[PDB]
């Protein structure tokens, strides 16, 4: 028997919505260690001989995400269900519901790791966005709130 705050997970986001979430999220990769290093050597070769705006990426640290929700800066928050200590993330759907930040439980922790240059991530969030994907993001917010939140209003109940 599962106490309602556990198994608020497993009632995860479905097939098509999850695919569309990654269609958005895979656009916003953090610049990998190799890519970042080569860019700075390009900067070294250029600026030593002879401007840029703030670049948007996903935010992916548990401490960083728990900061961003309640900041409030997070817009979408993805949460993996499979976590070795489950108690690490059990409060997080409640925190998002309380602060009114739209969240989604995604399926697979390594699935979050792929979009983020890590092995696993447990939580991923998209704070800010480029102007072109703004309408698409807000549409996905409504899509997730209709599919995830409104269908499973009774997820806080039932063992």
Q: Which stretch binds RNA (CB under 7 A): 3-11, 95-103, 118-126, 146-154?
A: 118-126
Bridge partners, residue 113, by sequence: none
Q: Using the minimum distance from each CB to RNA, give the nearer residue, 81 or 127.
A: 127
Q: Is 120 in the site for RNA (CB under 7 A)?
A: yes
Q: Are 74 and 101 in contact (CB under 8 A)?
A: yes
State residue 74 phi and psi, 5-degree precision. -65, 140
Please state, as a whole number, how many other Cβ atoms lie within 10 Å of the Cβ of residue 20. Answer: 16
Residue 50, contacted partner among another protein, RNA, none, CB below 5-8 A by kind? none
Q: Are 104 and 21 in contact (CB under 8 A)?
A: yes
Q: Using the minimum distance from each CB to RNA, give the nearer residue, 38 or 145.
A: 38
Q: Is 55 in the site for RNA (CB under 7 A)?
A: yes
Q: Which two tokens stand for residue 143?
A: 């899509």
Interactions with another protein, residue window 66-85 (CB under 8 A): 66-67, 84-85
Q: Which stretch binds another protein (CB under 8 A): 71-79, 110-118, 130-138, 142-150?
A: 110-118
Q: Is 91 in the site for another protein (CB under 8 A)?
A: yes
In angstroms, the CA 63 to CA 71 distance is: 12
Q: Which stretch binds RNA (CB under 7 A): 1-9, 11-19, 25-33, 149-157?
A: 25-33
Q: Are 155 and 12 in contact (CB under 8 A)?
A: no
At residue 81's C-alpha, the angle toward residues 70 and 137, to 5°, is 55
Please state, as a whole number, how many other Cβ atoms lie within 10 Å of the Cβ of residue 35. Answer: 12
Q: Is 26 in the site for another protein (CB under 8 A)?
A: yes
Residues found near RNA in the complex (CB under 7 A): 30-31, 33-34, 36-37, 41, 54-55, 59-64, 66-67, 84, 88, 109-111, 113-114, 116, 118-123, 127
């Amino acid at each position: 028997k599962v106490p309602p705050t556990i198994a608020q997970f497993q009632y995860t986001l479905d097939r098509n919505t999850a695919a569309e979430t990654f269609k958005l999220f895979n656009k916003y990769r953090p610049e990998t260690a190799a890519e970042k290093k080569e860019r700075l050597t390009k900067e070294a070769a250029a600026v030593a001989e002879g401007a840029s705006p703030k670049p948007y990426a996903v935010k992916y640290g548990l401490n960083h995400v728990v900061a961003l929700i309640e900041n409030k800066k997070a817009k979408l928050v993805l949460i993996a269900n499979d976590v070795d200590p489950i108690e690490l993330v059990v409060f997080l759907p409640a925190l998002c519901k309380k602060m009114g930040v739209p969240y989604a439980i995604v399926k697979g922790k390594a699935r979050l790791g792929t979009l983020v240059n890590q092995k696993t991530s447990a939580v991923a969030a998209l704070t800010e966005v480029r102007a072109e994907d703004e309408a698409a993001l807000a549409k996905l917010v409504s899509t997730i709130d209709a599919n995830f939140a409104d269908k499973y209003d009774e997820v806080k109940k039932h063992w």
